[PDB]
């Protein structure tokens, strides 16, 4: 199996930033498309990146604040965070599309355990 190791979650204030990472191991043939998904509600897409670094985002609003990049190690840089960005973030892999990507979860067969991201309003935030 492809194995996915997530890191970089935490608790921040609204307007803050976090950088998630996902490291894929167990890749023996096709390098995977790596995607980030989140679930606060149903699971939803965020962004995906193909084996050569080309990215696709769920919406323009998301693309304006988050950036996905690839070194099989992928980063999701999250800026200008909204309270509503609070969720468990999951990385996922698709090795059945030649290394290329779709944004939808039904193309992904390997899932990380999830990493919690908590974004608090100014009134609620404590270090």
Author numbering: 1 to 40, 43 to 52, 52A, 53 to 72, 76 to 82, 82A, 82B, 82C, ...
What text appears in the publication on this structure?
VHHs correspond to the antigen-binding domain of heavy-chain only antibodies (hcAbs) that, besides conventional IgGs, occur in all members of the Camelidae. Notably, VHHs are characterized by long CDR3 loops (average of 17 amino acids (aa) in contrast to human HCDR3 with on average 12–13 aa in length), which is often a feature of bnAbs against HIV-1 and may allow penetration through the highly glycosylated surface of Env into conserved epitopes not accessible to conventional antibodies. Based on these favorable features of nanobodies, we aimed at selecting broadly neutralizing nanobodies against HIV-1 from dromedaries immunized with soluble trimeric gp140 SOSIP immunogens. Overall, we could select Env-specific nanobodies from 25 families, of which six nanobodies showed potent neutralization of primary heterologous Tier 2 HIV-1 strains from several subtypes in a standardized pseudovirus-based in vitro neutralization assay.
Crystal structures were determined so far for VHH-5 (2.3 Å resolution) and VHH-28 (1.15 Å resolution); for A6 no crystal structure is available yet. Both, VHH-5 and VHH-28, have a long CDR3 region that folds over to partially mask the face of the VH domain that would be involved in contacts with the VL domain in a typical Fab fragment. The CDR3 of VHH-28 (19 residues long; H93-H102) is two amino acids shorter than that of VHH-5 (21 residues). In both structures, CDR3 is tethered to the body of the VHH by a disulfide bond between residue H33, and H100C or H100B, in VHH-5 or VHH-28, respectively. CDR2 (H50-H58) is 9 residues long in VHH-5, and 10 residues long in VHH-28; however, the H52A insertion in VHH-28 is accommodated by a bulge in the loop around residues H60-H62, so that the CDR2’s are the same length at their tip, and both adopt the canonical structure H2–9A, with residues 52–55 forming a type-I β-turn in VHH-5, and 52, 52A, 53, 54 forming the same turn in VHH-28. Interestingly, both nanobodies are derived from the phage library 54A2 at timepoint t2 after the late second immunization boost with optC SOSIP. For two of the broadest neutralizing VHHs, VHH-9 and VHH-28, binding to optC SOSIPs by ELISA correlated with potent neutralizing activity of the optC pseudovirus (IC50 0.03–0.04 µg/ml). VHH-9 and VHH-28 bound very well to optC SOSIP, but only weakly to ZM197M, which would explain why there is competition with CD4bs mAbs on the first, but not on the latter. Evidently, the neutralization patterns of VHH-28 and VHH-A6 show some degree of complementarity, as they cover all but two HIV-1 strains in the panel, including the epidemiologically most relevant subtypes C, A and B. 3D reconstructions of ZM197M-VHH A6, 5, and 28, each resolved at ~25 Å, were used to dock in a high resolution model of BG505 SOSIP.664-PGV04 complex, which confirmed the presence of extra density at the CD4bs.
